[PDB]
Curated annotation (Swiss-Prot), chain B:
Region Disordered: start-end pairs: 36-55
Locations listed in the record: Nucleus, Nucleolus; Nucleus, Nucleoplasm
Its biological purpose: Component of the NOP7 complex, which is required for maturation of the 25S and 5.8S ribosomal RNAs and formation of the 60S ribosome.
Oligomeric and partner information: Component of the NOP7 complex, composed of ERB1, NOP7 and YTM1. The complex is held together by ERB1, which interacts with NOP7 via its N-terminal domain and with YTM1 via a high-affinity interaction between the seven-bladed beta-propeller domains of the 2 proteins. The NOP7 complex associates with the 66S pre-ribosome.
Transmembrane segments: none
Residue ranges, compositional bias (Basic and acidic residues): 40-55
Name recorded for this polypeptide: Ribosome biogenesis protein ERB1
Source species: Chaetomium thermophilum (strain DSM 1495 / CBS 144.50 / IMI 039719)
Recorded superkingdom: Eukaryota
Organism phylogeny: Eukaryota, Fungi, Dikarya, Ascomycota, Pezizomycotina
Gene, per the UniProt record: ERB1
Similarity comment text for this entry: Belongs to the WD repeat BOP1/ERB1 family.
Length: 183, 95, 184, 380, 183
RNA sequence: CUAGUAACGGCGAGUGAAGCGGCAACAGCUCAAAUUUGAAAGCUGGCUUCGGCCCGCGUUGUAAUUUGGAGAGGAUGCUUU
């Protein structure tokens, strides 16, 4: 049960050992590329609860994103921008999920989990082979990931009345004049 | 172990194929007991030992022996075989 | 920097040498062997590093200084004293006649007049001593395969054969024939 | 109306140098040489070495393009890559530490030092090399004579003693075939050693056997190269004597006894069961070999001409006719020395050599010991 | 003058930074590793308890299946796997623990010396995640634990445990709570 | 249908839902959080006489068990392939 100890550590990320590790890793990542491949996740507890498995077909990619304003504000999140740049880089993979890994004064650093839909280790596993279907091509561009669902407001309740079934679908329905035959 | 020729057909030799020239047959010089005409002078043996190796027309000159137990084994036998081995795999042959 | 473990291994391995050598000198200089005389071929075996003086002089007496060389020896009452003294550094057993045949033909080297030259000819065997019934290579084998009245003289002409190092491979009854077979 | 380059086309395609050959083959410098003896690839010379390559020297060696194409299309190249990783994997369990895994990989290696059988399968290589069984006897001129030389030779790192014991086994197998079918006709001796000439299916085979004496290998010689021609002529003579042994119909391989061979029987250790001018010379004769006389060549010659009973000393060997010289059954006793039984006639081995050469029973009075030997003649 | 490659320089600068910064006292304790004698004596016992390889496990299965066609006790091996070993620590089922000093997400092993201290299990930080993986027939192994040994060697395990609580954990005692590096 | 209701509004222009109710269609599940630890039991490739052999992934975790209107482990006895 080592991963329960890691979950409590990520909670305390201002603390002495986690501030030290985030400092020495953010320094290392600045000399690296903007988008580069990570052999293993920096937070293996977070990746695994987001869906990462140590199988042939799962890869981890680390990306830095510029932080600040676009006072115009970009409605696209920094996490969604992190997903979209990696999916452009790996046009053959599928973006599964992403998580925060580090940040700086200029950049924000994210690790993204990708799944190879053509690897037949992936194709044979019923827990993941839904992603081999072509309705899951480029989920990060359609807002189908966890960042996208948050920014689209796909939550139950009276607070999310305009957006829970699709915001534009709601507007088209309410702005349609419906005429029947026997009026 | 299986037999080789379950299907054998003749093959014409290409003109590029240059075979190795065969070694000369053992002549009358190589014998242990030559005639006294083939027996050389002791001065000729002493001069032949004085010159350096690989500077002679013949690497061997005869010497009359009486018995088989008096006949020794050749010192440079493996040297001659190895020099042959370098001859047919490191020295090219002009047609 | 010799580690301490090596020091302790030394002393325990020298005390066991002292204990066994006392047991040899306690009982007698004899071995439980039938009265029929045989011949033993002994081969140097890599063993205990530090040699006590009494096993060392017995290697010197058997001209066994450098490693892996080997000599022939018959059985006397005195030989069994040297056999069980130098035993942890040697391998011994009765060889076979064909095992001698390779040892004089393929493994044969020469010793005459204090300098070690290889065997040259049968007449050179005559030139070496060639006198006490020594006419060919089989003279040595006759003194070895059969017990020789001048086998001590035959050993005097003899030199310890520098046997060949094998690659990855108590009295042996005839299992010493397998010893040279990997060591020829 | 177009032009090309002179150096690019033509003689550069047909002939390439040894350096260009090993680069195209993509093998190490030694690994080319074992493969090149295997397929019989020979360097040869073009008519113009300057025209083939402008930057060339007479010391440099060229090679045939199709022969390199034959070298590229060999299964040994795949076997070289699989075996190269196999010695890489024998450094695996040795490095990390696994004695059992190092063993099971090295029984799978099947290394020649403990088998005698060769490391690589030479079946398809000799399939493409020698075309007919007559050329096997033509190549038996070289095949036998080194293995009689190698069987007398001691062991080195390149040639294990089990390889020589298999050489001495295979050299004895060809001898047992010759003494059954009496194919040995002519024999010559010289400073180099003993030459034998035998005709098999109309093909004369000549091989040289030096005397039973350790030979100095002093100088610059390659045992790694020499160990390959052991593997060459092991399989060839093993193939040659397999074909001829079913040709004579006797069951193959011949049965062998270990410890009775270990007693020093040499030639006489093995049993042969026939179902699974030469004969008239010494058809009914009795022979004894003394202490000086060469035991191996005398027994080989006598059994090749149908001598029924040959005896010798108990220290020369065992499993023979009765050692005792007082036994009056012996007609001729071979003695070379510097009882005096009137029944036994006292002779030399030279009388045997000249009476087997002329095939006319040369007189033992002219060949009486204690007298000067008349000069002999070469059969060639 | 001459120019060095990018990943070459970053390897050396991280080594300088991890040893010269103000390291918190949970990573600084990993700089203290046991002696050469104690490591050699540890692997003398542990190599006697090596897990079976895939080749010899299959051989034993073929042995027992053959005898069925034509009686044993519990196997005592060396326990490995971070999630497995932490559970063996938490149930007090382990007797000696060995921890690799070079786990590159170090968060997987930071709590592990202190968790063994809390439950009383003797631990020793060892050089080589590669060395432990060799012991347990993998490329890598972050942690290695012994639980129970056979009766022929209960004495030399208790001697090895006493050599850890005397030769290693006594020297670490007043230097595991102090910050590393400086300058 | 609620309903041009609530709500927000240079309270002008105007903008403008949702719950309930009647229908259409209906279907529920997979992980992470556990020690298989009396046995990485899992998987990709290659060679294949297609039968089963090797390499590699993987213990920084691949199978089986479990997913909080649950569950696990024992015990007990019926019922299912």
């Amino acid at each position: 049960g080592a991963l329960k100890y890691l979950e409590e550590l990520s909670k305390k990320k201002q603390s002495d050992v986690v501030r030290f590790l985030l400092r020495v890793r953010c320094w290392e990542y600045r000399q690296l590329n903007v988008i580069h491949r990570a052999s293993r996740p920096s937070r293996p507890d977070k990746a695994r609860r987001l869906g990462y498995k140590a199988k042939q077909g799962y890869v981890i990619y680390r990306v830095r994103v510029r932080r600040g304003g676009r006072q115009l504000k970009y409605q696209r999140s920094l996490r969604a921008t992190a997903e979209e740049r990696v999916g452009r880089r790996c046009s053959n993979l599928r973006v599964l999920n992403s998580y925060w890994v580090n940040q700086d004064s200029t950049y924000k650093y994210y690790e993204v989990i990708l799944v190879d839909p053509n690897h037949k280790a992936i194709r044979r596993d019923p827990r993941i082979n839904w992603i081999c279907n072509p309705v899951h091509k480029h989920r990060e561009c359609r807002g189908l990931t966890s960042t996208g669902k948050k920014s689209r407001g796909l939550n139950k309740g009276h607070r999310f009345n305009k957006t829970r079934a699709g915001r534009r679908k709601t507007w088209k329905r309410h702005n349609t004049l419906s005429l029947w035959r026997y009026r | 172990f299986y037999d080789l020729w379950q299907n054998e057909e003749p093959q014409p030799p290409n003109p590029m194929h240059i075979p190795a020239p065969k070694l000369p047959p053992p002549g009358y010089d190589l014998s242990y007991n030559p005639p006294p005409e083939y027996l050389p002078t002791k001065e000729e043996r002493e001069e032949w030992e004085k010159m350096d190796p690989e500077d002679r027309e013949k690497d061997y000159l005869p010497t009359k022996y009486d018995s088989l137990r008096k006949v020794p084994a050749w010192g440079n036998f493996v040297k001659e075989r190895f020099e042959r081995c370098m001859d047919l795999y490191l020295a090219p042959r002009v047609r | 920097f010799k580690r301490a473990e090596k020091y302790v291994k030394e002393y325990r391995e020298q005390e066991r040498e002292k204990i066994r050598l006392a047991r040899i000198a306690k009982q007698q200089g004899s071995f439980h062997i039938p009265a029929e005389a045989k011949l033993v071929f002994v081969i140097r075996i890599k063993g205990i590093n530090k040699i006590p003086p009494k096993p060392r002089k017995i290697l010197q007496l058997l001209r066994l200084r450098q490693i892996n060389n080997g000599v022939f020896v018959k059985v006397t009452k005195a030989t069994a004293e040297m056999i069980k003294i130098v035993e942890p550094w040697v391998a011994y057993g009765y060889p076979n006649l064909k095992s001698v045949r390779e040892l004089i033909y393929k493994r044969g080297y020469g010793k005459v007049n204090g300098q070690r030259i290889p065997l040259t000819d049968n007449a050179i065997i005559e030139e070496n001593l060639g006198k006490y019934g020594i006419i060919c290579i089989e003279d040595l084998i006759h003194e070895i395969f059969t017990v020789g009245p001048n086998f001590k003289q035959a050993a005097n002409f003899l030199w310890p054969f520098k046997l060949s190092n094998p690659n990855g491979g108590g009295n042996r009854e005839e299992h010493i024939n397998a010893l040279i077979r990997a060591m020829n | 109306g177009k032009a090309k380059k002179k150096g690019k086309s033509g003689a550069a395609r047909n002939y390439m140098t040894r350096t260009q050959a090993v680069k195209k083959l993509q093998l190490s410098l030694p690994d080319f040489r074992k493969l090149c003896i295997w397929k019989g690839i020979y360097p040869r010379e073009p008519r113009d070495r300057r025209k083939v390559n402008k930057s060339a020297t007479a010391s440099t060696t060229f090679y045939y393009t199709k022969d390199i194409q034959y070298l590229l299309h060999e299964p040994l190249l795949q076997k070289f890559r699989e075996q190269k990783a196999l010695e890489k994997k024998i450094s695996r369990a040795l490095g990390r530490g696994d004695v059992s895994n190092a063993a099971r990989l090295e029984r799978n290696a099947n290394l020649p030092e403990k088998t005698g059988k060769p490391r690589y399968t030479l079946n398809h290589i000799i399939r493409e090399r020698y075309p007919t069984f007559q050329d096997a006897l033509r190549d038996l001129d070289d095949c036998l004579s080194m293995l009689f030389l190698f069987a007398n030779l001691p062991s080195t790192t390149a040639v294990p003693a089990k390889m020589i014991a298999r050489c001495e086994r295979l050299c004895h197998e060809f001898q047992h075939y010759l003494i059954v079918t009496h194919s040995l006709r002519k024999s010559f001796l010289s400073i180099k050693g003993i030459y034998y000439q035998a005709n098999i299916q109309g093909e004369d085979i000549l091989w040289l056997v030096p005397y039973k004496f350790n030979q100095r290998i002093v100088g610059d010689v390659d045992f790694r190269i020499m160990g390959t021609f052991v593997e060459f002529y092991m399989t060839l003579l093993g193939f040659v004597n397999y074909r001829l042994y079913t040709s004579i119909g006797l069951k193959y391989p011949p049965k062998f006894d270990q410890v009775k061979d270990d007693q020093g029987a040499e030639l006489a250790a093995f049993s042969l069961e026939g179902l699974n001018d030469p004969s008239q010379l010494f058809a009914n004769f009795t022979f004894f070999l003394s202490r000086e006389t060469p035991r191996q060549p005398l027994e080989f010659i006598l059994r090749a001409f149908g001598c029924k009973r040959i005896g010798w000393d108990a220290v020369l060997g065992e499993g023979a006719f009765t050692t005792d010289e007082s036994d009056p059954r012996i007609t001729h006793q071979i003695i070379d020395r510097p009882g005096r039984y009137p029944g036994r006639i006292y002779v030399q081995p030279q009388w045997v050599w000249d009476s087997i050469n002329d095939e006319e029973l040369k007189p033992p009075e002219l060949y009486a010991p204690g007298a000067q030997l008349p000069p002999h003649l070469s059969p060639f | 003058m001459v120019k060095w490659p990018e990943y070459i320089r970053l390897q050396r600068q991280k080594k300088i930074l991890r040893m010269r910064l103000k390291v918190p006292p949970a990573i600084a304790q990993f700089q203290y590793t046991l002696d050469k004698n104690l490591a050699a004596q540890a692997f003398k016992l542990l190599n006697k308890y090596r897990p079976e390889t895939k080749q010899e496990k299959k051989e034993r299965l073929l042995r027992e299946a053959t005898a069925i066609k034509e009686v044993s006790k519990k196997p005592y091996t060396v326990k490995y796997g971070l999630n497995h070993v932490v559970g063996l620590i938490e149930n007090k089922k382990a007797s000696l623990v060995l921890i690799a000093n070079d786990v590159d997400p170090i968060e997987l092993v930071v709590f592990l010396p202190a968790l063994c201290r809390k439950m009383g299990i003797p631990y020793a930080i060892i050089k080589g995640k590669a060395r432990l993986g060799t012991l347990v027939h993998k490329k890598t192994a972050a942690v290695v634990a012994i639980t129970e040994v056979r009766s022929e060697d209960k004495n030399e395990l208790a001697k090895l445990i006493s050599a850890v609580k005397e030769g290693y954990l006594e020297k670490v005692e007043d230097t595991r709570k102090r910050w590393g590096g400086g300058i």
